């Protein structure tokens, strides 16, 4: 409910043309340090680490680029970079000790929307699931190697974002958005089950999951999703037991287009972030607390995340990319609170305030004594 | 019927030639079988004489200057009167009685026809002078004959006679058409013709069981001469289909035979060639062709085929003199009985020519002077022009 | 005769003085020298023997006889004397007295004498400091030719540094020969004490209210062992008064002291020539008058930061001094000439209203960065607006650079790509097909509601939709083996253009597109006529390819198509040898072939038209151990392809694919069964030629005739007896044994014989016996069904031969 | 360069549709005023265990919906009479040149003297013939209590002096030479006048500054109404601020707008001669608002610089008590913070409620919030009074 003003900003020099879904943040070099990938539809991938304004490296592979990301697909207790093109190409990176060309290449069907990396099974591999823009779903898994395929489910509305979470048993599942603010759940690959939620029902509609709720929790846990519209609504839910218990909706008069998570406030919980084709940014805890951010620049795409910015730290971070062939990136988005308060309704609640008050013989009743107090405890020492 | 028995046996007998032992009968039915109709006895003389008719017709010896009529014809109120309807007690019942009318009208057809077959040969006899026997026209009258007279005679008891007569008739025919087809080189029909005539020949002829009346031996005579006539015509497409020394064992089976004596000529006497000539008569080839096929019709230099060349091809260097004599001379050869004569400097060739046919014209040539006063040479041709024009084959009509 | 008193203390600088006389007298008389003066007089003058105002109080006298002639004013003539004596003194007394001071291990002694002449490090001499400025300035009062003045006042202080390097610029402009020293007093002491300053410090003073001197002095370093010779050439007024002989020289050094008192500036140029002076203080003057001038940021730009745009506006007319006005200061300002390259060169009162972002080039030049980025913004949204009503409204070819700027203005909303499989290795021409493709979907766009976009002059084409809402534009291209379109959106309620983009995405239909496109292709190509795909094309590969990546029957696709595989019996023969059979004579089964592409393959391909309110065309293809031999494997593909329509169906197994493929069926296995026999003839037909069972096999299937029903003149052959059958078969065995075939039978109660000749391949003629029964008969063999006769030739020449032996066989049975 | 990290943490901020001016700004409640008429209200409201900022629009009566705003001023009256003074000086677009007016708003009713609400509509129109540059208050020592009075800044280089009446309870206007005998013959525009009274004493001092730079103090008994003395220098660009403070003996601070902000140190013996300059505050364009309060906890004052490009520089007073003449005590940079528009006016008042003052900075844009560190400010005071107590009980 209140605005604030980012100051502290780096800019990366960026020319060309990108799918909303071509750009991610991630360790590639395995040094526990976050980088950050950039594809384009030119068929080069550049690479920034730390605070150059040049690209880190760029990497090209054959074809036009629809998805990147970076982690552990061949199960060998490393992280590499999956390039995904548009005719179903396949390429993989190890940016790990002058284009940098790629180890392995294997040719999937084309059509390819939207990534995705993790074990959604159970059975200690990661597997890699692929959108279409055909409404199609395809899993994999590397078979040690190559990729062999899982299985191949059907939708009827069109796929924007695959999510993995933790089903009411104890299990990682398999969200796909869908048109009308619904999604539906995939059966794991060793059919399609949907869920709804009251607009027009061809709003597109995107979809995350995977929210921590404590610290130290990222290990094993799961259980709150997100869901956001182009309309300009979004919703927070649980995905527990039998029905799925509406945590929170929020309206707003924006073409909302992306969905990520945070942790600005440092206390173990993830904030979602959000943001608008006009650049109104969006952090909403599980609270009901909105923060409101405006870049008054129209962006293209968006990516909320760990980023190490500055004398080696990840820190989370805030990356638009506008028209200006620039990519925006703001590293202290970190806050003390998220809420209004105030010091004398932060210090009724610690019992050392009141010990000491009655101590004093001063009884917090009478707020103009207790005021002149602290006055006199502030700004007059002797 | 009792009656007709004896006269089914008495008609049958005469199938072959029983005319002495048919009197006999009919002279036991004349008075050891009496007390009978009378027409019995009539039918019986009727018959008697007719064997003795039938006997002079076989002859064929009665009639060269005739008689030959009218004992012939003398038998027309004989078979006539023979059937008298009915009346007074005669024979049999009245059940079979009147069996003989529909014979005795079969006699009456008979013995017209056998009158008109007389005539016939007759006319063919006066005709055999001539110079040539136009076989057309004995064709073109012969068939009046054969159609108004057939199928004239049948109450199943006189079918013997009627085979004899139909190939005393059919017989003929062929012989003449082959006559005919011959003269105007009609490979097939003549060869059909003829060889039908062969078969029907032998069943009534050589199943004899006496000597065959004259008659016969004409006929045979006839046939004989006709087979070595066809031979030598066609003798140079016939060569083609055997051996040159295989022919020769059939060449010497024709009781004229025509090829030999050439052959043995040009060997007894050095020559240039002997060559046989069919003008066209204002023509397909060698052989049987198709039914209707591409006859590219006769032109230049080509109304003079040799049909039959002895030694070796024509000579192209000897034939632009042969159809320049042929038409410079083209008259007295037309009387049939002459042979022409020229002998030149540059070719030093005597090209003897008679004329035995219309159609046909036999040549020869030498090598140098002839001296036509020869007579070696002329009477060789004569000989063989005296064979292929019939004049004794139409005329030795009777003895 | 009239005499003047001089003081005693020039007693020796009468070479000197007499030298600063002859110019002093030289201004007011144009020439004992004689003068004229025009009263006319003639003045004849010659010398005779006898602090600041004791110095000049007016010991030699001057002894001058003057003949005047009318109103000379002789009282008048002598004070001007008494002025010019007095000013000489004077003038030689500022020459030789502070002229010659200086301005403030030999090498390094050398070097602090260089340091001293030119003084940028040191201290200033005492002359230089109280002495020259009140010398210069008291001989103004008394008339003389060497002496300036100027004064100015400017709004502010900070200009000192902007006016210091325009000043210097501007007097080494006028004047080679001079040099500028900046010589700042030291803001602790005074007496003399004035400390040079580096060129660059900006103002090393932040504290205000501190009135700061500044010590310009401007002086020829070559004016030294120099005034003897020429100096300046010609921009000194003056040279050595009288001569430079007698090895006594006068000081016609010039200097130059600027000043100032917190602000007021003041020239004392001396020396300088006189027209060339006036134009220097002219200059200055004007140069000062030009930086006052710009005072309109302190006006209009510092007054306005602060929301006071009614206060202090431009042309008000700070202060109205009537002095010189201000020619800067005119209605007709030249603002963007005044905060930039400070000179007097040789709407503003909101102009930061409500816009985020030496004093004077720091405070005006975001002003001027400010005012051009509204003129960027500007062109931008006229380029953006200009479009949108030409296009809506009025139903031109924006070049390259309006291209881009729309498509960087725009989305990205949707995409999508499709597959071109004619290419094998995406499993001149192809390209040939591809502009065809883009074509097609060019007419289908069109068809919509679409207006191409044209390109005036500087294979993708863009095409465009305007609507209320805003602008949609779509890019079609060949990128690889795929063809992609993308869809631009451009926003000018504020839902109902996305409903628009919405709608018009539904009705994109690639797939179904490139289903018609292919299946017609197919059966173009299948008739022949329209030789669009390469020759030797394997049809059956692209067949299974396209079937293996549309198994589905994509959704609004018109054409149909089915794939099937058959197995026939052949049991006779083999089933390839069949194949190869029904290939050689395809023609005859109206059916055609395909030379598919060093090892050859054919197909058989078969259409037609089939209307079932349907109206399709309807395209067949066929192509194909001792088991499998005796198995014929032939896989055939249905095609069905529409008529009228072309574009994909904007609206929503098959019957008239299961209605064709039905009797496809049945006639394949009619041709086969059918097919089977018309080669199991013809194989041994050709081996005949070289089997009794073989021999009789035949005759069950070929055409023979009777001799009797070619020409009855044969018919006397039908009845003649066994034997002559005999005598002939003997006949023509002995005659061609190369012809004659005989056969028998293993009883002898049947033979067959068979005469040819090569040649007339079409019949052989036969005769045949049985010798048991009798049944002889005489025929001619056809293989084929003789169509017919008039309403061959060949043929009858057996007829004759064979009949030609048929007369000498009679013959011999005759002779 | 900044020797310490700015404490202050930013609260709250509101957008302002329009921009304000210096003088917009105005005072647990504030008010901002806007250009484009806006007048807005900011405060905060408790609830439970937090707080929520508050600004609401005001409706005043007697100006039209096409005039625009040039000054605002509010004050409360002398302790003998209540009642909140409110004054705006507005101009009338109607006509080639702007026509000046001034409203004045006090509810004179019982019951409605602090009420803001009455107060909003109780306006007395009073016509000008002259541009307003800024509107202040002042205390005088008027026969045995004081009064404060209004002062007006002219068009015509002179000060307007507004007296409420004893008697029909209006506000007419008065002489200025009456009571203020060292506000007159002036040359260019007061900018900005400070006057500061001493307590428990009849004299006080006056600070002003023009367009023209000429900076005017002047020391005035107020029983004799008599100048006691009188100081004047000649500065560079317009004044945009002057404070009269004594740092621990009185000093004053001149913030020029193209010259540093400098103090000049023991006014009643030295003058206006021997001043101290603050390093380096030049470098960030043109210093708009300026403000003398304690902002280290310290109970020493501090200086608060607010410059056009958006700087909040803070000097603090090292102490002479130190004991460093190489290096004499002077100021220095202690923090400084950034904005993201320029600001124009600064406040520092105890909005919330706790004691610890805020910071309101009013800023192109619209107003931020700034508070103090809570973290900090929560241990600084434990420490003190854990100290306190234990001298307390070793001590006594």
Same mark, same amino acid.
């Given at each position: 409910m209140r605005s604030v003003s980012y100051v502290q900003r780096v800019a990366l020099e960026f020319s060309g043309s990108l799918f909303p879904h071509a750009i991610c943040l991630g360790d590639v070099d395995n040094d526990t340090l976050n980088e950050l990938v950039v594809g384009d539809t030119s068929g080069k991938v550049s690479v920034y680490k730390n605070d150059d304004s040049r690209p880190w490296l760029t990497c090209s592979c054959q074809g036009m680029l629809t998805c990147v990301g970076v982690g552990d697909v061949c199960n060998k207790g490393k992280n590499l970079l999956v390039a995904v093109s548009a005719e179903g190409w396949f390429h993989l990176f190890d940016l790990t000790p002058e284009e940098q060309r790629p180890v392995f290449k294997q040719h999937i069907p084309a059509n390819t929307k939207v990534m995705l990396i993790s074990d959604i099974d159970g059975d200690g591999c990661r597997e890699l699931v692929v959108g279409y823009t055909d409404r199609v779903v395809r899993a994999f898994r590397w078979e040690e190697g190559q990729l062999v395929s899982l299985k191949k489910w059907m939708l009827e509305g069109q796929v924007d974002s695959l999510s993995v979470t933790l089903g009411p048993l104890g299990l990682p599942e398999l969200m796909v958005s869908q048109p009308g603010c619904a999604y539906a759940i995939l059966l794991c690959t060793w059919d399609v089950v949907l869920h709804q939620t009251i607009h027009n029902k061809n709003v597109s509609t995107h979809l995350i999951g995977n929210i921590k709720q404590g610290h130290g929790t990222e290990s094993s846990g799961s259980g709150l999703f997100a869901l956001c519209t182009l309309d300009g609504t979004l919703k927070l839910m649980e995905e527990m037991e039998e029905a799925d218990k509406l945590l929170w909706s929020v309206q707003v008069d924006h073409q909302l287009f992306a969905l990520e998570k945070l942790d600005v406030t440092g206390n173990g919980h993830e904030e979602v972030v959000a943001c608008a084709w006009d650049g109104q940014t969006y952090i909403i805890d599980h609270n009901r607390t909105v923060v409101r951010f405006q870049v008054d620049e129209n962006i293209r795409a968006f990516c909320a995340g760990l980023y190490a910015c500055k004398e080696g730290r990840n820190s989370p971070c805030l990356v638009y990319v506008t028209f200006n062939q620039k990519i925006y990136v703001y590293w202290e988005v970190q806050l003390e609170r998220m809420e209004s308060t105030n010091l004398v309704k932060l210090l009724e609640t610690k019992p050392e305030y009141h010990s000491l008050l009655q101590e004093l013989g001063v009884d917090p009743d009478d707020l103009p004594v207790t005021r002149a107090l602290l006055h006199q405890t502030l700004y007059h020492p002797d | 019927?009792?009656?007709?028995?004896?006269?089914?046996?008495?008609?049958?007998?005469?199938?072959?030639?029983?005319?002495?032992?048919?009197?006999?009968?009919?002279?036991?039915?004349?008075?050891?079988?009496?007390?009978?109709?009378?027409?019995?006895?009539?039918?019986?003389?009727?018959?008697?004489?007719?064997?003795?008719?039938?006997?002079?017709?076989?002859?064929?010896?009665?009639?060269?200057?005739?008689?030959?009529?009218?004992?012939?014809?003398?038998?027309?109120?004989?078979?006539?009167?023979?059937?008298?309807?009915?009346?007074?007690?005669?024979?049999?019942?009245?059940?079979?009685?009147?069996?003989?009318?529909?014979?005795?009208?079969?006699?009456?057809?008979?013995?017209?026809?056998?009158?008109?077959?007389?005539?016939?040969?007759?006319?063919?006899?006066?005709?055999?002078?001539?110079?040539?026997?136009?076989?057309?026209?004995?064709?073109?009258?012969?068939?009046?004959?054969?159609?108004?007279?057939?199928?004239?005679?049948?109450?199943?008891?006189?079918?013997?006679?009627?085979?004899?007569?139909?190939?005393?008739?059919?017989?003929?025919?062929?012989?003449?058409?082959?006559?005919?087809?011959?003269?105007?080189?009609?490979?097939?029909?003549?060869?059909?013709?003829?060889?039908?005539?062969?078969?029907?020949?032998?069943?009534?002829?050589?199943?004899?069981?006496?000597?065959?009346?004259?008659?016969?031996?004409?006929?045979?005579?006839?046939?004989?001469?006709?087979?070595?006539?066809?031979?030598?015509?066609?003798?140079?497409?016939?060569?083609?289909?055997?051996?040159?020394?295989?022919?020769?064992?059939?060449?010497?089976?024709?009781?004229?035979?025509?090829?030999?004596?050439?052959?043995?000529?040009?060997?007894?006497?050095?020559?240039?060639?002997?060559?046989?000539?069919?003008?066209?008569?204002?023509?397909?080839?060698?052989?049987?062709?198709?039914?209707?096929?591409?006859?590219?019709?006769?032109?230049?230099?080509?109304?003079?085929?040799?049909?039959?060349?002895?030694?070796?091809?024509?000579?192209?260097?000897?034939?632009?003199?042969?159809?320049?004599?042929?038409?410079?001379?083209?008259?007295?050869?037309?009387?049939?009985?002459?042979?022409?004569?020229?002998?030149?400097?540059?070719?030093?060739?005597?090209?003897?020519?008679?004329?035995?046919?219309?159609?046909?014209?036999?040549?020869?040539?030498?090598?140098?002077?002839?001296?036509?006063?020869?007579?070696?040479?002329?009477?060789?041709?004569?000989?063989?022009?005296?064979?292929?024009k019939n004049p004794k084959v139409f005329a030795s009509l009777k003895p | 005769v009239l005499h003047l008193a001089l003081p005693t203390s020039c007693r020796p600088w009468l070479p000197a003085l007499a030298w600063y006389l002859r110019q002093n007298l030289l201004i007011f008389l144009h020439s004992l020298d004689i003068y004229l003066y025009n009263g006319v007089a003639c003045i004849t003058l010659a010398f005779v023997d006898e602090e600041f105002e004791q110095l000049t109080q007016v010991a030699p006298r001057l002894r001058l006889d003057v003949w005047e002639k009318g109103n000379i004013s002789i009282v008048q003539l002598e004070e001007k004397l008494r002025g010019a004596a007095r000013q000489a003194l004077a003038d030689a007394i500022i020459e030789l007295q502070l002229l010659p001071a200086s301005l403030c291990g030999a090498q390094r002694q050398k070097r602090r004498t260089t340091q001293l002449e030119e003084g940028e490090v040191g201290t200033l001499h005492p002359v230089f400091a109280r002495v020259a400025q009140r010398w210069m300035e008291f001989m103004v009062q008394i008339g003389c030719a060497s002496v300036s003045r100027s004064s100015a006042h400017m709004v502010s202080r900070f200009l000192l540094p902007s006016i210091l390097s325009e000043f210097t610029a501007l007097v080494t402009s006028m004047a080679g020969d001079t040099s500028v020293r900046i010589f700042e007093q030291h803001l602790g002491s005074e007496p003399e004490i004035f400390g040079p300053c580096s060129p660059g410090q900006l103002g090393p003073s932040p504290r205000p209210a501190a009135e700061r001197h500044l010590l310009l002095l401007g002086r020829n370093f070559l004016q030294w062992r120099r005034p003897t010779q020429q100096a300046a050439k010609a921009m000194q007024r003056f040279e050595p008064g009288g001569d430079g002989s007698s090895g006594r020289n006068a000081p016609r050094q010039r200097l130059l002291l600027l000043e100032v008192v917190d602000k007021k500036l003041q020239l004392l140029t001396y020396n300088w020539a006189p027209d060339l002076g006036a134009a220097l203080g002219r200059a200055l003057v004007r140069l000062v008058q030009w930086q006052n001038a710009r005072a309109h940021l302190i006006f209009c730009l510092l007054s306005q930061k602060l929301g006071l745009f009614h206060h202090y506006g431009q042309l008000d007319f700070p202060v109205r001094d009537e002095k010189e006005p201000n020619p800067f200061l005119l209605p007709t300002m030249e603002v963007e000439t005044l905060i930039r390259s400070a000179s007097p060169p040789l709407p503003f009162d909101e102009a930061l209203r409500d816009i985020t972002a030496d004093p004077v080039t720091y405070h005006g030049q975001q002003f001027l960065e400010i005012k051009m980025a509204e003129r960027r913004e500007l062109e931008r949204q006229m380029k953006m607006e200009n479009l949108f009503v030409t296009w809506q409204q009025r139903s031109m070819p924006?070049?390259?650079?309006?291209?881009?700027?729309?498509?960087?203005?725009?989305?990205?909303?949707?995409?999508?790509?499709?597959?071109?499989?004619?290419?094998?290795?995406?499993?001149?021409?192809?390209?040939?097909?591809?502009?065809?493709?883009?074509?097609?979907?060019?007419?289908?766009?069109?068809?919509?509601?679409?207006?191409?976009?044209?390109?005036?002059?500087?294979?993708?084409?863009?095409?465009?939709?305007?609507?209320?809402?805003?602008?949609?534009?779509?890019?079609?291209?060949?990128?690889?083996?795929?063809?992609?379109?993308?869809?631009?959106?451009?926003?000018?309620?504020?839902?109902?253009?996305?409903?628009?983009?919405?709608?018009?995405?539904?009705?994109?239909?690639?797939?179904?597109?490139?289903?018609?496109?292919?299946? %017609?292709?197919?059966?173009?190509?299948?008739?022949?006529?329209?030789?669009?795909?390469?020759?030797?094309?394997?049809?059956?590969?692209?067949?299974?390819?396209?079937?293996?990546?549309?198994?589905?029957?994509?959704?609004?696709?018109?054409?149909?198509?089915?794939?099937?595989?058959?197995?026939?019996?052949?049991?006779?023969?083999?089933?390839?040898?069949?194949?190869?059979?029904?290939?050689?004579?395809?023609?005859?089964?109206?059916?055609?072939?395909?030379?598919?592409?060093?090892?050859?393959?054919?197909?058989?391909?078969?259409?037609?038209?089939?209307?079932?309110?349907?109206?399709?065309?309807?395209?067949?293809?066929?192509?194909?151990?001792?088991?499998?031999?005796?198995?014929?494997? @032939?896989?055939?593909?249905?095609?069905?392809?529409?008529? %009228?329509?072309?574009?994909?169906?904007?609206?929503?197994?098959?019957?008239?694919?299961?209605?064709?493929?039905?009797?496809?069926?049945?006639?394949?296995?009619?041709?086969?069964?059918?097919?089977?026999?018309?080669?199991?003839?013809?194989?041994?037909?050709? %081996?005949?030629?070289?089997?009794?069972?073989?021999?009789?096999?035949?005759?069950?299937?070929?055409?023979?005739?009777?001799?009797?029903?070619?020409?009855?003149?044969?018919?006397?052959?039908?009845?003649?007896?066994?034997?002559?059958?005999?005598?002939?078969?003997?006949?023509?065995?002995?005659?061609?044994?190369?012809?004659?075939?005989?056969?028998?039978?293993?009883? @002898?109660?049947?033979?067959?014989?068979?005469?040819?000749?090569?040649?007339?391949?079409?019949?052989?003629?036969?005769?045949?016996?049985?010798?048991?029964?009798?049944?002889?008969?005489?025929?001619?063999?056809?293989?084929?069904?003789?169509?017919?006769?008039?309403?061959?030739?060949?043929?009858?020449?057996?007829?004759?031969?064979?009949?030609?032996?048929?007369?000498?066989?009679?013959?011999?049975?005759?002779? | 360069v900044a020797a310490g990290p700015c404490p202050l943490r930013e609260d709250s901020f509101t957008r302002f549709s329009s921009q304000s001016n210096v003088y917009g700004l105005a005072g647990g409640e504030l008010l901002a005023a806007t250009l484009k008429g806006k007048?807005?209200?900011?405060?905060?409201?408790?609830?439970?265990?937090?707080?929520?900022?508050?600004?609401?629009?005001?409706?005043?009566?007697?100006?039209?919906?096409?005039?625009?705003?040039?000054?605002?001023?509010?004050?409360?009256?002398?302790?003998?009479?209540?009642?909140?003074?409110?004054?705006?000086?507005?101009?009338?677009?109607?006509?080639?040149?702007?026509?000046?007016?001034?409203?004045?708003?006090?509810?004179?009713?019982?019951?409605?003297?602090?009420?803001?609400?009455?107060?909003?509509?109780?306006?007395?129109?009073?016509?000008?013939?002259?541009?307003?540059?800024?509107?202040?208050?002042?205390?005088?020592?008027?026969?045995?209590?004081?009064?404060?009075?209004?002062?007006?800044?002219?068009?015509?280089?002179?000060?307007?002096?507004?007296?409420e009446n004893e008697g029909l309870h209006q506000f007419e206007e008065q002489p200025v030479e009456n009571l203020f005998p060292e506000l007159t013959n002036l040359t260019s525009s007061v900018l900005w006048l400070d006057v500061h009274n001493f307590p428990g004493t009849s004299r006080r001092l006056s600070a002003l500054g023009c367009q023209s730079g000429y900076v005017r103090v002047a020391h005035v008994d107020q029983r004799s109404r008599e100048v006691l003395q009188m100081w004047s220098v000649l500065q560079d660009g317009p004044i945009s601020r002057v404070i009269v403070f004594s740092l621990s003996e009185y000093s004053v601070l001149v913030a020029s707008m193209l010259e540093p902000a400098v103090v000049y140190r023991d006014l009643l013996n030295r003058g206006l001669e021997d001043q101290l300059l603050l390093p380096g505050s030049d470098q960030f364009d043109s210093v708009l608002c300026s403000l003398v309060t304690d902002v280290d906890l310290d109970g020493r004052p501090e200086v608060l610089v607010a410059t056009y490009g958006q700087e909040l520089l803070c000097y603090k007073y090292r102490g002479p008590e130190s004991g460093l003449p190489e290096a004499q005590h002077g100021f220095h940079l202690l923090w400084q913070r950034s904005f993201s528009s320029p600001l124009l006016a600064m406040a520092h008042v105890d909005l919330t409620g706790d004691g610890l003052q805020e910071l309101a900075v009013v800023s192109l844009k619209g107003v931020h919030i700034l508070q103090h560190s809570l973290i900090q400010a929560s241990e600084l005071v434990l420490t003190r009074l854990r100290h306190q107590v234990e001298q307390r009980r070793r001590r006594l």
């Open positions: - | 019927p009792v009656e007709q028995a004896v006269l089914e046996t008495f008609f049958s007998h005469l199938g072959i030639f029983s005319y002495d032992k048919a009197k006999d009968n009919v002279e036991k039915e004349r008075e050891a079988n009496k007390s009978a109709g009378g027409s019995w006895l009539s039918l019986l003389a009727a018959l008697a004489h007719l064997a003795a008719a039938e006997k002079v017709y076989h002859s064929l010896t009665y009639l060269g200057q005739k008689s030959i009529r009218t004992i012939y014809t003398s038998l027309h109120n004989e078979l006539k009167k023979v059937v008298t309807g009915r009346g007074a007690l005669g024979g049999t019942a009245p059940h079979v009685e009147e069996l003989l009318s529909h014979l005795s009208e079969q006699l009456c057809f008979f013995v017209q026809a056998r009158m008109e077959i007389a005539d016939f040969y007759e006319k063919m006899y006066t005709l055999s002078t001539q110079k040539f026997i136009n076989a057309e026209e004995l064709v073109g009258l012969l068939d009046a004959i054969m159609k108004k007279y057939s199928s004239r005679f049948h109450h199943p008891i006189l079918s013997p006679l009627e085979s004899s007569f139909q190939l005393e008739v059919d017989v003929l025919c062929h012989l003449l058409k082959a006559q005919a087809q011959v003269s105007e080189w009609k490979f097939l029909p003549s060869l059909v013709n003829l060889h039908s005539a062969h078969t029907k020949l032998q069943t009534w002829g050589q199943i004899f069981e006496v000597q065959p009346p004259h008659l016969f031996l004409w006929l045979m005579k006839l046939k004989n001469m006709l087979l070595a006539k066809f031979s030598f015509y066609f003798h140079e497409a016939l060569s083609r289909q055997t051996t040159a020394s295989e022919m020769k064992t059939l060449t010497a089976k024709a009781n004229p035979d025509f090829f030999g004596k050439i052959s043995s000529f040009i060997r007894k006497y050095d020559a240039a060639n002997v060559s046989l000539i069919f003008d066209n008569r204002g023509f397909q080839g060698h052989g049987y062709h198709h039914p209707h096929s591409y006859r590219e019709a006769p032109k230049g230099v080509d109304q003079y085929p040799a049909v039959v060349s002895l030694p070796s091809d024509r000579p192209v260097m000897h034939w632009p003199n042969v159809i320049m004599i042929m038409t410079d001379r083209t008259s007295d050869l037309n009387s049939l009985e002459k042979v022409v004569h020229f002998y030149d400097d540059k070719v030093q060739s005597t090209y003897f020519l008679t004329r035995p046919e219309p159609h046909f014209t036999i040549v020869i040539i030498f090598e140098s002077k002839k001296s036509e006063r020869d007579s070696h040479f002329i009477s060789f041709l004569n000989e063989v022009s005296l064979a292929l | 924006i070049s390259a650079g309006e291209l881009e700027t729309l498509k960087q203005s725009s989305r990205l909303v949707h995409y999508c790509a499709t597959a071109m499989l004619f290419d094998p290795a995406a499993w001149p021409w192809l390209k040939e097909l591809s502009l065809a493709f883009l074509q097609q979907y060019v007419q289908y766009l069109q068809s919509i509601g679409f207006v191409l976009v044209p390109l005036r002059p500087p294979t993708t084409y863009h095409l465009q939709r305007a609507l209320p809402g805003g602008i949609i534009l779509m890019e079609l291209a060949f990128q690889g083996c795929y063809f992609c379109v993308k869809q631009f959106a451009l926003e000018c309620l504020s839902m109902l253009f996305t409903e628009e983009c919405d709608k018009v995405r539904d009705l994109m239909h690639v797939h179904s597109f490139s289903y018609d496109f292919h299946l %017609r292709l197919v059966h173009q190509h299948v008739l022949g006529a329209h030789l669009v795909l390469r020759h030797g094309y394997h049809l059956t590969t692209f067949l299974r390819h396209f079937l293996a990546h549309h198994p589905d029957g994509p959704h609004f696709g018109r054409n149909h198509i089915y794939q099937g595989t058959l197995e026939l019996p052949t049991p006779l023969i083999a089933a390839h040898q069949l194949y190869n059979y029904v290939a050689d004579h395809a023609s005859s089964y109206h059916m055609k072939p395909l030379r598919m592409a060093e090892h050859n393959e054919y197909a058989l391909v078969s259409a037609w038209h089939s209307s079932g309110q349907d109206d399709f065309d309807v395209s067949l293809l066929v192509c194909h151990g001792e088991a499998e031999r005796h198995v014929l494997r @032939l896989q055939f593909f249905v095609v069905l392809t529409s008529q %009228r329509e072309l574009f994909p169906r904007l609206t929503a197994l098959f019957p008239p694919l299961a209605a064709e493929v039905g009797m496809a069926r049945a006639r394949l296995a009619q041709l086969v069964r059918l097919a089977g026999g018309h080669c199991r003839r013809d194989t041994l037909w050709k %081996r005949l030629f070289l089997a009794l069972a073989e021999l009789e096999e035949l005759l069950e299937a070929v055409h023979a005739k009777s001799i009797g029903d070619i020409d009855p003149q044969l018919d006397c052959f039908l009845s003649m007896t066994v034997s002559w059958y005999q005598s002939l078969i003997k006949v023509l065995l002995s005659r061609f044994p190369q012809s004659c075939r005989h056969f028998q039978s293993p009883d @002898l109660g049947t033979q067959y014989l068979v005469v040819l000749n090569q040649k007339f391949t079409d019949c052989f003629v036969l005769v045949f016996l049985d010798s048991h029964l009798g049944k002889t008969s005489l025929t001619v063999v056809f293989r084929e069904p003789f169509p017919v006769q008039p309403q061959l030739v060949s043929t009858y020449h057996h007829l004759e031969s064979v009949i030609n032996t048929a007369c000498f066989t009679l013959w011999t049975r005759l002779l | 007048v807005l209200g900011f405060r905060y409201q408790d609830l439970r265990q937090k707080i929520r900022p508050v600004a609401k629009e005001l409706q005043f009566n007697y100006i039209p919906v096409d005039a625009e705003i040039v000054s605002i001023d509010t004050f409360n009256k002398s302790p003998p009479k209540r009642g909140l003074v409110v004054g705006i000086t507005f101009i009338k677009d109607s006509g080639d040149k702007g026509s000046p007016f001034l409203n004045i708003y006090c509810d004179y009713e019982p019951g409605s003297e602090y009420n803001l609400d009455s107060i909003a509509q109780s306006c007395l129109n009073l016509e000008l013939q002259f541009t307003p540059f800024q509107l202040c208050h002042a205390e005088v020592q008027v026969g045995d209590q004081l009064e404060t009075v209004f002062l007006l800044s002219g068009n015509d280089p002179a000060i307007h002096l507004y007296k």
